[PDB]
Amino acid sequence: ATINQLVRKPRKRMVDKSDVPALQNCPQRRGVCTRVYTTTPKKPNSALRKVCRVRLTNGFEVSSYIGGEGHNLQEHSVVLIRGGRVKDLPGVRYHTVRGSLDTSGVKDRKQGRSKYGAKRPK
Amino acid sequence: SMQDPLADMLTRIRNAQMAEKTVVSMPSSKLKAAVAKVLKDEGYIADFQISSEVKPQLSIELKYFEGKPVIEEVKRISRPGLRQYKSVEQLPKVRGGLGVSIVSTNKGVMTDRAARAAGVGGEVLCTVF
RNA sequence: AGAAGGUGCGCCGGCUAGGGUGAAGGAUUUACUCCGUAAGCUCUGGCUGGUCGAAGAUACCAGGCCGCUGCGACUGUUUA
RNA sequence: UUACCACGGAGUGAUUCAUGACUGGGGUGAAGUCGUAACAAGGUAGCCGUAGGGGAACCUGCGGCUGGAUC
RNA sequence: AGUUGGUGGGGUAAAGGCCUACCAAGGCGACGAUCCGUAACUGGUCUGAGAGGAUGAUCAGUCACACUGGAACUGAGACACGGUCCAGACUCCUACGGGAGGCAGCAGUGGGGAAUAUUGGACAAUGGGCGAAAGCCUGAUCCAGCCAUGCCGCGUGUGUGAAGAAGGUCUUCGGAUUGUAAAGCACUUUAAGUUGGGAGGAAGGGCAGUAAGUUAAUACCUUGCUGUUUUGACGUUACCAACAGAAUAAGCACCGGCUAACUUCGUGCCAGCAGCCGCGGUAAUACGAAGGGUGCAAGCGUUAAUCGGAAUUACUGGGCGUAAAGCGCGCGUAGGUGGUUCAGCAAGUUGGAUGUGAAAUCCCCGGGCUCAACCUGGGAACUGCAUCCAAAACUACUGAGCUAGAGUACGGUAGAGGGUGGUGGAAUUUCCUGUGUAGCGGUGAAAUGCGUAGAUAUAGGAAGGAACACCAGUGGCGAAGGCGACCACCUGGACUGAUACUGACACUGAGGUGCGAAAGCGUGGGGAGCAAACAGGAUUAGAUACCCUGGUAGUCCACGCCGUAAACGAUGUCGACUAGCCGUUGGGAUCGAUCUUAGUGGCGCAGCUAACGCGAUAAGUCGACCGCCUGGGGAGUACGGC
Ligand SMILES: [Mg+2]
Ligand SMILES: [Mg+2]
Ligand SMILES: [Mg+2]
Ligand SMILES: [Mg+2]
Ligand SMILES: [Mg+2]
Ligand SMILES: [Mg+2]
Ligand SMILES: [Mg+2]
Ligand SMILES: [Mg+2]
Ligand SMILES: [Mg+2]
Ligand SMILES: [Mg+2]
Ligand SMILES: [Mg+2]
Ligand SMILES: [Mg+2]
Ligand SMILES: [Mg+2]
Ligand SMILES: [Mg+2]
Ligand SMILES: [Mg+2]
Ligand SMILES: [Mg+2]
Ligand SMILES: [Mg+2]
Ligand SMILES: [Mg+2]
Ligand SMILES: [Mg+2]
Ligand SMILES: [Mg+2]
Ligand SMILES: [Mg+2]
Ligand SMILES: [Mg+2]
Ligand SMILES: [Mg+2]
Ligand SMILES: [Mg+2]
Ligand SMILES: [Mg+2]
Ligand SMILES: [Mg+2]
Ligand SMILES: [Mg+2]
Ligand SMILES: [Mg+2]
Ligand SMILES: [Mg+2]
Ligand SMILES: [Mg+2]
Ligand SMILES: [Mg+2]
Ligand SMILES: [Mg+2]
Ligand SMILES: [Mg+2]
Ligand SMILES: [Mg+2]
Ligand SMILES: [Mg+2]
Ligand SMILES: [Mg+2]
Ligand SMILES: [Mg+2]
Ligand SMILES: [Mg+2]
Ligand SMILES: [Mg+2]
Ligand SMILES: [Mg+2]
Ligand SMILES: [Mg+2]
Ligand SMILES: [Mg+2]
Ligand SMILES: [Mg+2]
Ligand SMILES: [Mg+2]
Ligand SMILES: [Mg+2]
Ligand SMILES: [Mg+2]
Ligand SMILES: [Mg+2]
Ligand SMILES: [Mg+2]
Ligand SMILES: [Mg+2]
Ligand SMILES: [Mg+2]
Ligand SMILES: [Mg+2]
Ligand SMILES: [Mg+2]
Ligand SMILES: [Mg+2]
Ligand SMILES: [Mg+2]
Ligand SMILES: [Mg+2]
Ligand SMILES: [Mg+2]
Ligand SMILES: [Mg+2]
Ligand SMILES: [Mg+2]
Ligand SMILES: [Mg+2]
Ligand SMILES: [Mg+2]
Ligand SMILES: [Mg+2]
Ligand SMILES: [Mg+2]
Ligand SMILES: [Mg+2]
Ligand SMILES: [Mg+2]
Ligand SMILES: [Mg+2]
Ligand SMILES: [Mg+2]
Ligand SMILES: [Mg+2]
Ligand SMILES: [Mg+2]
Ligand SMILES: [Mg+2]
Ligand SMILES: [Mg+2]
Ligand SMILES: [Mg+2]
Ligand SMILES: [Mg+2]
Ligand SMILES: [Mg+2]
Ligand SMILES: [Mg+2]
Ligand SMILES: [Mg+2]
Ligand SMILES: [Mg+2]
Ligand SMILES: [Mg+2]
Ligand SMILES: [Mg+2]
Ligand SMILES: [Mg+2]
Ligand SMILES: [Mg+2]
Ligand SMILES: [Mg+2]
Ligand SMILES: [Mg+2]
Ligand SMILES: [Mg+2]
Ligand SMILES: [Mg+2]
Ligand SMILES: [Mg+2]
Ligand SMILES: [Mg+2]
Ligand SMILES: [Mg+2]
Ligand SMILES: [Mg+2]
Ligand SMILES: [Mg+2]
Ligand SMILES: [Mg+2]
Ligand SMILES: [Mg+2]
Ligand SMILES: [Mg+2]
Ligand SMILES: [Mg+2]
Ligand SMILES: [Mg+2]
Ligand SMILES: [Mg+2]
Ligand SMILES: [Mg+2]
Ligand SMILES: [Mg+2]
Ligand SMILES: [Mg+2]
Ligand SMILES: [Mg+2]
Ligand SMILES: [Mg+2]
Ligand SMILES: [Mg+2]
Ligand SMILES: [Mg+2]
Ligand SMILES: [Mg+2]
Ligand SMILES: [Mg+2]
Ligand SMILES: [Mg+2]
Ligand SMILES: [Mg+2]
Ligand SMILES: [Mg+2]
Ligand SMILES: [Mg+2]
Ligand SMILES: [Mg+2]
Ligand SMILES: [Mg+2]
Ligand SMILES: [Mg+2]
Ligand SMILES: [Mg+2]
Ligand SMILES: [Mg+2]
Ligand SMILES: [Mg+2]
Ligand SMILES: [Mg+2]
Ligand SMILES: [Mg+2]
Ligand SMILES: [Mg+2]
Ligand SMILES: [Mg+2]
Ligand SMILES: [Mg+2]
Ligand SMILES: [Mg+2]
Ligand SMILES: [Mg+2]
Ligand SMILES: [Mg+2]
Ligand SMILES: [Mg+2]
Ligand SMILES: [Mg+2]
Ligand SMILES: [Mg+2]
Ligand SMILES: [Mg+2]
Ligand SMILES: [Mg+2]
Ligand SMILES: [Mg+2]
Ligand SMILES: [Mg+2]
Ligand SMILES: [Mg+2]
Ligand SMILES: [Mg+2]
Ligand SMILES: [Mg+2]
Ligand SMILES: [Mg+2]
Ligand SMILES: [Mg+2]
Ligand SMILES: [Mg+2]
Ligand SMILES: [Mg+2]
Ligand SMILES: [Mg+2]
Ligand SMILES: [Mg+2]
Ligand SMILES: [Mg+2]
Ligand SMILES: [Mg+2]
Ligand SMILES: [Mg+2]
Ligand SMILES: [Mg+2]
Ligand SMILES: [Mg+2]
């Protein structure tokens, strides 16, 4: 682009949209489990993944992934969700925080048990 | 349509320097003459001559020294589309002083070294190294 | 499309602007002629007050309007 | 008593959000059904514009290109 | 439409359409008015080598607001944050007649939220209001409370200690590792604990005397000094000393590559992990544990967000033949840019001086808290703006020039350049007529179809429509699309030679304006051949195709519309330079040869390119202007305008 062409119309910055439209500029948000189900990953992977559909205080309805080996979420469970996309599951953009409000974290876990809300065995 | 004659002068010099020639001929003007003189004082050319007869022709004889030409990088700075001017503190250095940059000031067309010697900035015409 | 809807309108004063007709005068083609005319008569307006009543297009006269659809393009014709 | 004016009324428009019986395409999915259109001259050389036709990929006419093999 | 200007008048502390009555028809706008969305601004902050990008918490300056909408009064100052009046929404009291309220002041509550604290102390210090002075008030302020929220500092011990203890883990069963790590032995008491000492934040106020000045006066009063008395929320201050003892005080993430750190045991495409590549289906250094190790450390990780890396919006500092990307092609408006001489001017440009650019912050040299964070002195900086002085190379402006760009006048050359009429020959088809008789046509092979109602072939005549063999060429002309029979008429441009003339009149070009293959659309003609649609026959598993026999729109003409193409050299226009060789179309010169122009082709040195390849008809070296690109799909699609 020539100098005169740039004077008539200067260069424009593109804006990068967030990958987490819900929880608008928030670290975490709480919601209610409208249902808890289980789904199947994409092609190269084979498993049976646990997922909860959550309605947020925003009014948004999204899907979160439940980490760890076990969980105790059921209908009308109040949960806290954070960002983070699960690559295998299509449409899952959030993670459920273990051990915050109603999730209680995993049990019998002893290595790296701060991402799963587990107390020190002591 | 020759909206810049000085760029044509430098282009002719570079093109015929690359082609292993000895003399370059072009239409002359009182600015190209000053540029040729300041190059002569810097040892970048052999000699320059201005013809008579209403339509003067300026001819320049080149130098080669080794198997490689003396002028290896000559570039115009202030074009009719940009018109760059600089102060004394902002006069550019080419190759960290190993080259020369031609500056047009109210004291005439001279080199950047002479420009700081007189403490007068102006318009940066071209850089030669 | 007069879509829809709205505002003013009587009477008595003050100031003010135009048109038509038309004495006297002037011209020459001297006469069933041309120009032009003060008053009078007549027709259009403008902005400013005041005043009465419950109400001034006061009586007679004098469109109700709008939104979706079927049929037939329309004005016309037909079972006295 | 007049002038200015807030609230509030009446009529008719513009714009912008959410929602709507029912509909049109798109994307993503898994060992589903029908064909085989392209890639080799892909077995009728392929594409481009336009028109008609057909379960579908597509076929045919008219003009154009080589980003077409043998020679 | 008080909209823009003028006059007279009113009004204000003051200029002014601020207001009013007349007069005029003006004012703003592609240098973006009006309208829509969003948002207090700045000093600054964070990132970045810088240029930039993002952003206005805390502190400071300005502005606006005080339940919602109005209005004024009092006042030096208000349209008034704990004032008045009017109206509204929402709460409340009531003895039922009747009134009150405004935490976006400090604490505090409910609510919303992922999320942000005490109904604390004192006016001792600095300020503010009143008073003359004591003094009174002050949720400003100074201090405390809570919270790893951040930055900084310090602890959780130190030395010796090999049977290389016991246990755990691994193993080739020898051993290795945890590891001087532990135990044992000997030291020290920071911080916390207890006790005793102990500044600095303090200036002043009261009383008495003394000395000056005040007048008219040793009085009252103001001021100096002396003596006495009196003041602290913080506060059990900072700090200092003594006492006992190692006692009171380590966790989090990771270990396949990127990336420092590895082996076992469970599980078997499960359970699971995951920032990106990707691991897991029977020996998993990637899942879950255990031993070992690596990073940080009163913190460690995850999530959210900004900049960087990203030269990935490229001014510095990118590209467009084939990866995204040159408008189908011209003409031209605003704008951008301008061949060459003088002379002037001083807007741009350069240098200097002066004023300003708040403080704080960032940077340098210092000074204090035991260090640091923190506080603080001076400087530097604040790259800007404004006014004067000086210079004249370049750009701009003004006057006069010049002929190298551009154009005009005069003879010739070539050409499917365009338009309107007329006329030719070959051939196909159809109709009529003669001879003649059993096939014709078509295919890979067939069949449909045409034939004894006499076909095909053959001879003559007639009608009509369309295209223009041979010339014909890497040939020509045209802005592109495109343009081939011959002749006449009208008409544009280009090449070519000399002289004369004008004297920069030029290039590009957002918007706009036109021309623009084929197919298609409208009205009216025409219709031989061909031929979408369509019918029939084949092929085939099927054949809505390829093949065959027919065949309508259309293809042709006139006028109008449509605006598209692999509209391509996938290469914008204009100008200047840079080794050569072989052709060819027009034209010139000099003596078949040599030179020189304007096109059109083939190779090739430098140079360029990722490579292919381009290479005087650049994709090389450079200038001027315009258009366009920013991962693939969704999509050149939806909505809106035209
Ligand atoms: Mg993330
Ligand atoms: Mg009406
Ligand atoms: Mg009355
Ligand atoms: Mg009505
Ligand atoms: Mg109505
Ligand atoms: Mg209907
Ligand atoms: Mg009905
Ligand atoms: Mg009827
Ligand atoms: Mg009817
Ligand atoms: Mg009908
Ligand atoms: Mg009809
Ligand atoms: Mg009808
Ligand atoms: Mg009638
Ligand atoms: Mg009627
Ligand atoms: Mg009847
Ligand atoms: Mg109505
Ligand atoms: Mg309405
Ligand atoms: Mg409304
Ligand atoms: Mg709707
Ligand atoms: Mg709906
Ligand atoms: Mg429904
Ligand atoms: Mg095909
Ligand atoms: Mg195929
Ligand atoms: Mg094919
Ligand atoms: Mg086939
Ligand atoms: Mg092919
Ligand atoms: Mg298209
Ligand atoms: Mg086609
Ligand atoms: Mg068609
Ligand atoms: Mg179609
Ligand atoms: Mg077909
Ligand atoms: Mg067709
Ligand atoms: Mg074709
Ligand atoms: Mg007025
Ligand atoms: Mg006045
Ligand atoms: Mg006035
Ligand atoms: Mg605008
Ligand atoms: Mg706002
Ligand atoms: Mg950078
Ligand atoms: Mg910066
Ligand atoms: Mg920095
Ligand atoms: Mg801002
Ligand atoms: Mg604040
Ligand atoms: Mg302030
Ligand atoms: Mg100010
Ligand atoms: Mg202020
Ligand atoms: Mg101000
Ligand atoms: Mg204010
Ligand atoms: Mg308030
Ligand atoms: Mg409030
Ligand atoms: Mg108010
Ligand atoms: Mg009042
Ligand atoms: Mg009052
Ligand atoms: Mg007053
Ligand atoms: Mg105020
Ligand atoms: Mg007040
Ligand atoms: Mg107020
Ligand atoms: Mg205030
Ligand atoms: Mg208050
Ligand atoms: Mg009140
Ligand atoms: Mg009220
Ligand atoms: Mg009220
Ligand atoms: Mg309140
Ligand atoms: Mg408060
Ligand atoms: Mg607030
Ligand atoms: Mg709360
Ligand atoms: Mg809550
Ligand atoms: Mg918190
Ligand atoms: Mg607070
Ligand atoms: Mg005080
Ligand atoms: Mg008292
Ligand atoms: Mg208090
Ligand atoms: Mg702390
Ligand atoms: Mg924490
Ligand atoms: Mg905090
Ligand atoms: Mg052992
Ligand atoms: Mg101590
Ligand atoms: Mg003290
Ligand atoms: Mg003590
Ligand atoms: Mg490594
Ligand atoms: Mg892990
Ligand atoms: Mg295993
Ligand atoms: Mg890993
Ligand atoms: Mg593991
Ligand atoms: Mg973590
Ligand atoms: Mg993060
Ligand atoms: Mg982010
Ligand atoms: Mg991040
Ligand atoms: Mg950048
Ligand atoms: Mg990034
Ligand atoms: Mg970089
Ligand atoms: Mg650039
Ligand atoms: Mg690029
Ligand atoms: Mg370009
Ligand atoms: Mg391609
Ligand atoms: Mg183009
Ligand atoms: Mg092109
Ligand atoms: Mg174009
Ligand atoms: Mg254009
Ligand atoms: Mg155009
Ligand atoms: Mg196109
Ligand atoms: Mg042009
Ligand atoms: Mg111009
Ligand atoms: Mg010039
Ligand atoms: Mg100019
Ligand atoms: Mg000059
Ligand atoms: Mg200056
Ligand atoms: Mg400052
Ligand atoms: Mg120090
Ligand atoms: Mg001078
Ligand atoms: Mg025959
Ligand atoms: Mg014949
Ligand atoms: Mg062509
Ligand atoms: Mg056509
Ligand atoms: Mg058609
Ligand atoms: Mg037609
Ligand atoms: Mg027709
Ligand atoms: Mg036919
Ligand atoms: Mg056929
Ligand atoms: Mg046929
Ligand atoms: Mg036919
Ligand atoms: Mg049709
Ligand atoms: Mg035609
Ligand atoms: Mg073509
Ligand atoms: Mg193109
Ligand atoms: Mg391409
Ligand atoms: Mg072009
Ligand atoms: Mg070009
Ligand atoms: Mg041109
Ligand atoms: Mg050119
Ligand atoms: Mg050129
Ligand atoms: Mg070549
Ligand atoms: Mg290239
Ligand atoms: Mg390349
Ligand atoms: Mg340039
Ligand atoms: Mg340029
Ligand atoms: Mg250029
Ligand atoms: Mg995209
Ligand atoms: Mg995308
Ligand atoms: Mg996209
Ligand atoms: Mg479209
Ligand atoms: Mg859409
Ligand atoms: Mg549209």
Coordinates of N, CA and C (backbone and C1' of nucleotides) in Angstrom, one line a residue, chain E residues 94-122:
Chain E
rU94 P -48.8 3.3 63.8 O5' -50.0 4.3 64.0 C5' -49.9 5.4 65.0 C4' -50.8 6.5 64.5 C3' -52.2 6.3 64.3 O3' -53.0 6.3 65.5 C1' -51.4 7.5 62.5
rA95 P -53.9 5.0 66.0 O5' -55.4 5.5 65.7 C5' -56.4 5.2 66.6 C4' -57.0 6.5 67.1 C3' -57.1 7.6 66.1 O3' -58.3 8.4 66.4 C1' -55.8 8.3 68.0
rC96 P -59.7 7.9 65.7 O5' -59.4 8.2 64.1 C5' -59.6 9.5 63.6 C4' -59.3 9.6 62.1 C3' -60.3 8.9 61.1 O3' -60.2 9.7 59.9 C1' -58.2 8.0 60.9
rG97 P -61.6 10.1 59.2 O5' -61.4 11.7 59.0 C5' -60.2 12.3 58.5 C4' -59.9 13.5 59.3 C3' -58.5 14.2 59.0 O3' -58.6 15.0 57.8 C1' -58.8 14.0 61.3
rG98 P -57.5 15.0 56.7 O5' -56.1 15.2 57.4 C5' -55.8 16.4 58.1 C4' -54.7 16.2 59.1 C3' -53.3 16.2 58.5 O3' -52.7 17.5 58.3 C1' -53.6 14.3 59.9
rG99 P -51.5 17.7 57.3 O5' -50.2 17.3 58.1 C5' -48.9 17.4 57.5 C4' -47.9 16.5 58.3 C3' -46.6 16.2 57.6 O3' -45.6 17.3 57.8 C1' -47.5 14.2 58.3
rA100 P -44.4 17.4 56.8 O5' -43.6 16.1 57.0 C5' -42.8 15.8 58.1 C4' -42.2 14.5 58.2 C3' -41.1 14.2 57.1 O3' -39.9 14.8 57.4 C1' -42.6 12.3 57.3
rG101 P -38.9 15.2 56.2 O5' -38.4 13.9 55.6 C5' -37.7 12.9 56.4 C4' -37.4 11.7 55.7 C3' -36.7 11.8 54.3 O3' -35.3 12.0 54.5 C1' -38.4 10.2 54.2
rG102 P -34.5 13.3 54.0 O5' -33.3 12.6 53.2 C5' -32.8 11.4 53.6 C4' -32.6 10.4 52.5 C3' -31.8 11.0 51.3 O3' -30.9 10.0 50.8 C1' -33.9 10.3 50.6
rC103 P -29.6 9.6 51.5 O5' -28.6 9.1 50.4 C5' -28.2 7.7 50.3 C4' -26.9 7.5 50.9 C3' -26.3 6.1 50.7 O3' -25.5 6.1 49.5 C1' -26.2 6.6 53.0
rA104 P -25.6 4.9 48.4 O5' -24.5 5.3 47.3 C5' -23.2 5.6 47.7 C4' -22.6 6.7 46.9 C3' -23.1 8.1 47.4 O3' -22.5 8.6 48.5 C1' -23.1 7.9 45.0
rG105 P -23.2 9.7 49.5 O5' -21.9 10.4 50.2 C5' -20.8 9.6 50.5 C4' -19.9 10.3 51.6 C3' -19.4 9.4 52.6 O3' -18.1 8.9 52.3 C1' -20.5 11.2 53.7
rC106 P -17.9 7.3 52.4 O5' -17.6 7.1 53.9 C5' -16.6 7.8 54.6 C4' -16.6 7.4 56.1 C3' -16.8 6.0 56.3 O3' -15.6 5.2 56.1 C1' -18.1 7.3 57.8
rA107 P -15.8 3.6 55.9 O5' -16.0 3.0 57.3 C5' -16.7 1.8 57.5 C4' -17.3 1.6 58.8 C3' -18.3 0.5 58.9 O3' -17.8 -0.8 59.0 C1' -19.1 2.5 60.0
rG108 P -18.2 -1.9 57.9 O5' -19.7 -2.1 58.2 C5' -20.1 -2.5 59.5 C4' -21.6 -2.4 59.6 C3' -22.4 -3.3 58.6 O3' -22.4 -4.6 58.9 C1' -23.4 -1.2 58.8
rU109 P -22.6 -5.7 57.7 O5' -24.1 -5.6 57.4 C5' -25.1 -6.0 58.3 C4' -26.5 -5.8 57.8 C3' -26.8 -6.6 56.5 O3' -27.1 -8.0 56.7 C1' -27.7 -4.4 56.3
rG110 P -26.7 -9.1 55.7 O5' -27.9 -9.1 54.6 C5' -29.2 -9.3 55.0 C4' -30.2 -8.8 54.0 C3' -30.0 -9.3 52.6 O3' -30.5 -10.6 52.4 C1' -30.4 -7.0 52.5
rG111 P -29.8 -11.6 51.3 O5' -29.9 -10.8 49.9 C5' -31.2 -10.7 49.3 C4' -31.1 -9.8 48.1 C3' -30.2 -10.3 47.0 O3' -30.8 -11.2 46.1 C1' -29.7 -8.0 47.4
rG112 P -30.0 -12.4 45.5 O5' -29.1 -11.8 44.4 C5' -29.6 -11.2 43.2 C4' -28.6 -10.4 42.4 C3' -27.3 -11.2 42.1 O3' -27.4 -12.2 41.1 C1' -26.8 -9.0 42.9
rG113 P -26.8 -13.6 41.3 O5' -25.3 -13.5 41.2 C5' -24.7 -12.8 40.1 C4' -23.3 -12.3 40.4 C3' -22.3 -13.3 40.8 O3' -21.8 -14.2 39.8 C1' -22.1 -11.4 42.2
rA114 P -21.7 -15.8 40.0 O5' -20.2 -16.0 40.4 C5' -19.8 -17.0 41.3 C4' -18.4 -16.9 41.8 C3' -18.1 -15.7 42.8 O3' -18.4 -16.0 44.1 C1' -16.5 -15.7 41.0
rA115 P -19.2 -14.9 45.1 O5' -18.0 -13.9 45.4 C5' -16.8 -14.2 46.0 C4' -15.8 -13.1 45.8 C3' -16.1 -11.8 46.4 O3' -15.7 -11.7 47.8 C1' -15.3 -11.6 44.2
rU116 P -16.7 -11.0 48.9 O5' -16.0 -9.6 49.2 C5' -14.7 -9.6 49.8 C4' -14.1 -8.2 49.6 C3' -15.0 -7.0 49.9 O3' -15.0 -6.7 51.3 C1' -13.6 -6.7 48.0
rA117 P -16.4 -6.9 52.2 O5' -15.8 -6.8 53.7 C5' -15.0 -7.8 54.2 C4' -14.1 -7.3 55.3 C3' -14.7 -6.5 56.4 O3' -14.0 -6.7 57.6 C1' -13.1 -5.2 55.3
rU118 P -14.8 -7.3 58.9 O5' -14.8 -6.1 59.9 C5' -16.0 -5.5 60.3 C4' -15.8 -4.7 61.6 C3' -17.0 -3.8 62.0 O3' -17.1 -3.7 63.5 C1' -15.0 -2.5 61.8
rU119 P -18.2 -4.5 64.2 O5' -19.5 -3.5 64.1 C5' -19.6 -2.4 65.0 C4' -19.8 -1.1 64.1 C3' -19.7 0.2 64.9 O3' -19.0 1.2 64.2 C1' -21.9 0.0 63.9
rG120 P -18.2 2.3 64.9 O5' -16.9 1.6 65.5 C5' -16.9 1.0 66.8 C4' -15.6 0.9 67.4 C3' -14.9 2.2 67.9 O3' -15.3 2.6 69.2 C1' -13.4 1.0 66.6
rG121 P -15.2 4.1 69.6 O5' -13.7 4.4 69.7 C5' -12.9 4.1 70.8 C4' -11.6 4.8 70.8 C3' -11.6 6.3 70.8 O3' -11.8 6.9 72.1 C1' -10.1 5.6 69.2
rA122 P -12.5 8.3 72.2 O5' -11.4 9.3 71.7 C5' -10.2 9.5 72.4 C4' -9.2 10.3 71.6 C3' -9.8 11.7 71.3 O3' -9.7 12.6 72.3 C1' -8.7 10.8 69.4

